[PDB]
Structures are given as C-alpha cells and as structure tokens.
Symmetry: C2
Subunit: 286 residues, 2 copies
C-alpha cells in the first residue's frame, strides 16, 4: 500500500499503474500529454499534472516513458525534488541510455534501477510475468516485495544496461526460434498436419528436451572457445542443411530459412571453421 | 530376445545393433562392405555376408543403409526371402524415398515402417532417446516393445514419408533456434556474461515459458489463416527488430541474425501483411 508514482501513461505505463492500484497502492500518475489519466483515476489513481508534484508524492518513481522521450528531460524540472527518491526505469532504449540514466540519477541523489518487462501489458501483475532488473541492489532489495506485484523480479547485476541487453538478446533468440518453428510448420503443413497438432511434439517435447538440452550441453564449450569437432563438425551440419533444403523443395515449401542457415555455415567453413564444432560460428559475430 | 537383423553397419547401424545386443536379442548383422562387423561380433552378433542369409535369419529387419544407397538395391537380391518379413527403415533420405520404399516392400509381401532417429548414435538405447515412426500400424504394434529398447517409439501416421518430414521440420527449427541462441549469447557476452550463465535464464526459463508458450498460444491462429493484427502487428515487430539491430551495433556484435529476421518481415510488409499478426509470414512460404 505504499505510495507509488507512475510517470508515462502509454499502454505499458497504464498497465503498471493499474496493477499497482489492484495491489492496494496509493498511485499517483503523470503524463506529459493530457487524456490518458481518466481510466486510472476511475480505479483510484491520483492525477498530478506537474512532474514536481508527481515526484514529490512518492519515494518510488516507476518511469515508463515513450521511446522518443528521455528521463533527463521528462524528470528534469523535478531535479531538486528527486533527491532521496528512487527511479525504476522500465523503458530504456539501449544499454548506453540506461547507463547514462543511472549517472544522471546519481548526480541528483536518486537511487536507480533499470528494468525490462518480459511480457505484454495485459500480463503485468499476473502469473508468468517476469521483470529483469539491473542497477542498485539496495533499491532492488528495498522494493522487491512491491515490484513482485508486477512480476517475478530478477536482479541481474549492478551495471545499469544489463537488463536492456538481456532483453535484446532474449528477443533476438525468440524471433529466430519462431521463424524456425514457422518453417517447420509449413513443412508438416504440406502433408496436412495442423500447426496446433505439430506443437505437441515440437513444443511440448522437442523444444525443451532436444533444443534446450543441446544448448545447455554446448554452452561451456562456447566459453572455452576451442570448439573441437571430433564428435561432430560444422561441415557435417552443412550436409544436414542441404538435405533439409532438398526435402523442403520436394514438398513445395519455401527454402529461405534453411538456405540462410546454410549460408551462415558456409561463411564459417570459408573462414576455416569447417572441422570445428557448429557453435564456433558464434566467433564470426564478436 | 527375438532374433533381429541389422542391415547397414555405419555409425548409426552399429549403434542400433549394439543396443539390441544389450537388450538380449539374437542379432544378425550385414553390410555390403567388409570390416565393420568385428566390434559387434565381439558383443555376440552373428555376421551374415549374404543378404539372403541375413534377411532369412529374422522376421524383423532393421535397415540403416548409407545415404547413397537404396533399399531396393541393398535388399533386391533377397526379394523372394522378404515375403512375410518386416522392414523398419531408419535412413530414408526424403519423404518420397520412404513412400517408394513402402510400395517396394508391399510388392514383396513385406511389412514396412519408416523411422527417424532423433538422437545421435551414442544415445540410442538410453533415456531420452526418441524414434518417430510412420507406416504400418500393425508393424508398430507388433514390435513396439522391441523398438522401445532403442528409444521411445512414437507412431505419427500411416503415410510412410511422415517421419522423414517431421524430422526435417524439427531439425530446421533446431538450426534457426540455435542460431538465435548464439546471437543472444554473443550479445550478453559483449558485457562479459558467460554463455553457460546465460543459459540459466535463456533455456531454463525463457525457452519454454516464453518462446514455447507463445508458439502454443499462436498455433491455432495459423490454422485459422486470418492473422488479425489488432492486438499486435507484423509492422510493430519490425520496430522491435530495428531496436535489436541498433543495440547489437552499439555492443559491437554482428547484426546478420537480426537483419535477416527483419528482412523477412519487410517482405511480408511489402506483400501487404504489415497489419496482420507476425505469424502471417508463414504464408509467404507455402
């Protein structure tokens, strides 16, 4: 029930304020532009038009600005009032913007934690919601119980840009994995298998038990950095991808996904990694 | 303990024969070329140089030929002896080759089941081993208990090419997912996070709870085929991928993976799918 201020009332910011209201917090809401407060006010929020008033209402300042906006600007007029308060910033654009924001907050005597929301607005405050945080451990520990009302809180580290970096990484992985699933679905779909049927083997079993297990079994090899190909080489996987391409062609299914995959391996072979293990390809990318 | 013949003694074929020997079967082994039988003979296999003799030793014929070889040719000289026997073929190259093989077997009065082995040779006969099968339900049911010694047996359907199709699809998904993980790992690795550390969030949580859940939640939408973008559009995901690209560039991490992902979405936008949901992209591929 502590007081909280939510600065930024777009879709995510409004969901945050609503979830805090539903946990019994005294929520004050601010937005630069008018018209977004009414549904929250109907649920018990207090509107504050002036950022200085909004910041002054609460020690905990949950900030979810629009992508174009910046913390230093939105909260600049409240610079004096910020001393002794805490910012949890949930919409940094890049790791460098999060690191700049932490420095700005420190200058003003404000605690800072950066966080990445790992679910859409409709799932904030519900089971499965996870928020990844980076920045002050003190803030994290002081407000963990409050933050746990929004989603399971995970503290990654003290470097402010880590949460944006993890989110970027996880989302990159998501898009690649989803595109792989869609090619797979197209392939079984050419024999009449519905996608929802296919998920029984593809998601309930293959994804965790094969894909996930293989990644866990291979991750220490990446960190070691040698990639011996004794027990299976990058070259051999090129052959598998050629077979996938040919099967896709015989089924009348577009080959872009496997072709782009094979291209990547061909580049590693041309860079000398053909007798190394598959995961050596990461070394092209850093 | 029933008798079984294994035809083809490459790495996989030898693992199959060894696993059957370890379950107490009387295993007869054949290969076109000499030199591969000795380690199996040391474990109790019987060598048969003549395919007619090998086929005659057992009703259950487990066939794992080399990629270049074909069932009709390897087992052609045993055409008469094949009547009343059963072929479980574990190395068809394409769905059409499996469907040809089933027809060939039928002509000779042989039962036929095609199967795809979903683990490497070293894991055959061990927990986690899964084999996907397509073809005769009668064969599947007659020999399920024997086959379960090699891996959990799954019958997909009566069409002989389904197991090769499922395997192709699942492997396509695997390569895309692994490449996504490797880009993610490179990204967190640019801030010093080891890959093995990263798997704690990426594989133990994100992969099943986010990626998998999203695929299951979206699969019926693919089958419906309309892809309303009301609650989130293909275009909006283009913006997310632009942010991923920019973050990757700021971290000094190669942008090929996210760029290729964004390219795919740009094509769907140019085909008119921008206001549709993300998964509409599958429709470009079939």
């Amino acid at each position: 029930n502590l007081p909280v201020t939510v600065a930024g009332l777009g879709p995510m910011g409004s969901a945050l304020a609503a979830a805090l209201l539903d946990r019994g917090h005294d929520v004050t809401v601010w937005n630069r532009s008018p018209g977004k407060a009414a549904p929250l006010v109907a649920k018990g929020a207090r509107q504050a038009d002036d950022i200085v008033d909004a910041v002054s209402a609460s020690r905990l300042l949950v900030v979810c600005l629009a992508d174009y906006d910046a913390l230093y600007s939105a909260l600049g007029p409240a610079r004096e009032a910020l001393r002794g308060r805490v910012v949890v910033n949930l919409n940094s654009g890049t790791p460098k913007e999060a690191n700049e924001a932490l420095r700005w907050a420190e200058r003003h005597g404000t605690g800072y934690l950066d966080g990445a929301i790992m679910v859409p607005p409709a799932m904030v405050g519900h089971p499965g919601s996870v928020f990844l945080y980076s920045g002050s451990a003190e803030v994290f520990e002081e407000y963990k119980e409050t933050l746990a009302g929004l989603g399971d809180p995970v503290h990654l580290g003290t470097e402010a840009g880590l949460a944006v970096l993890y989110n970027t990484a996880l989302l990159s992985m998501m898009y690649s994995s989803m595109n792989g699933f869609l090619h797979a679905a197209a392939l079984v779909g050419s024999a009449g298998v519905p996608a929802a049927e296919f998920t029984k083997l593809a998601v309930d079993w293959f994804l965790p038990a094969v894909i996930g297990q293989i990644i866990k079994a291979e991750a220490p090899t990446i960190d070691e950095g040698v990639y011996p190909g004794d027990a299976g080489s990058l070259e051999m996987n090129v052959t598998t991808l050629k077979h996938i391409i040919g099967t896709s062609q015989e089924q009348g299914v577009d080959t872009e996904i496997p072709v782009r995959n094979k291209e990547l391996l061909d580049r590693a072979v041309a860079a000398g990694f053909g007798e190394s293990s598959y995961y050596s390809v990461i070394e092209l990318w850093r």
